[PDB]
Design a protein around this ligand. Structure first.
Ligand SMILES: N=C(N)N[C@@H]1CCCCNC(=O)[C@H](Cc2cccc(CN)c2)NC(=O)[C@H](CCCCN)NC(=O)Cc2cccc(c2)CNC(=O)[C@@H](CC2CCCCC2)NC1=O
Lengths: 40, 151
């Protein structure tokens, strides 16, 4: 299996960017396998 | 070569399995993207140097170099690199993952699996973490932790 990388862009902040998405506040847990889960 | 930038992680026709960041001669991505497998870069080989499945992170060529942190206040940009699409900046105000071991910034943006590893930026262009380890909420949408390592 050939895993490889190819460049995709410069790491830059865009000055006139779309602001979108909400800002949820969530109680979560993290297990030893690196998986997040919601608490409830 | 290891020139600074954001990169697609591909397997071979080819499939995009993720994304990562080259900085200071070190490639940074999420563990679930590569599972620590070696990466071809042009004619060269990049070998895994450090990783942690619980953080879901892995670095190649050297130690984790990204140390900028979300200030808990400001908007950020996801530099999304989705499979088959050009890189694009998405600005958002992060939410919060509240955990028993402190709070983690988290972004409510939804992209294909192979967008995993796309960098999250502060206003100065510093990488404050990588996108793609998160949770699914009741309405089916997605919230990603702003996952940052320790330098
Ligand atoms: N709305 C949803 N589900 N959005 C996701 C966004 C994925 C972003 C990249 N991250 C991942 O792929 C990781 C992989 C991964 C998986 C598991 C462990 C680890 C390592 N600890 C990593 N994964 C995730 O974090 C979450 C984790 C949940 C942990 C719970 N304890 N796992 C999922 O999301 C799985 C899932 C669930 C339901 C449905 C799907 C996947 C299928 N959905 C997709 O095919 C795309 C669809 C997109 C395409 C672009 C437009 C918007 C919709 N979305 C999606 O796939």
């Amino acid at each position: 299996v050939d895993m490889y990388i190819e460049r995709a862009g410069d790491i830059t902040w865009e000055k006139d960017a779309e602001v979108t998405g909400n800002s949820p506040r969530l109680d979560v847990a993290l297990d030893e396998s690196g998986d997040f889960s919601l608490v409830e | 070569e290891t020139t600074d930038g954001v990169y697609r992680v591909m397997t071979r026709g080819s499939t995009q399995v993720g994304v990562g960041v080259m900085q200071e001669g070190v490639f940074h991505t999420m563990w679930h993207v590569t599972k620590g497998a070696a990466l071809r870069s042009g004619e060269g080989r990049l070998d895994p140097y450090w990783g942690d499945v619980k953080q879901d992170l892995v670095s190649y060529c050297g130690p984790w170099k990204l140390d900028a942190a979300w200030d808990g206040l400001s908007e950020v940009q996801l530099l999304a690199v989705p499979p088959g699409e050009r890189a694009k900046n998405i600005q958002t105000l992060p939410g919060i993952f509240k955990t028993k071991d402190g709070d983690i910034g988290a972004v409510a943006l939804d992209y294909p699996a192979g967008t995993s590893g796309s960098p999250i930026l502060d206003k100065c262009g510093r990488v404050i973490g990588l996108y793609g380890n998160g949770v699914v909420i009741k309405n089916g949408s997605y919230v990603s932790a702003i996952t940052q390592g320790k330098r």
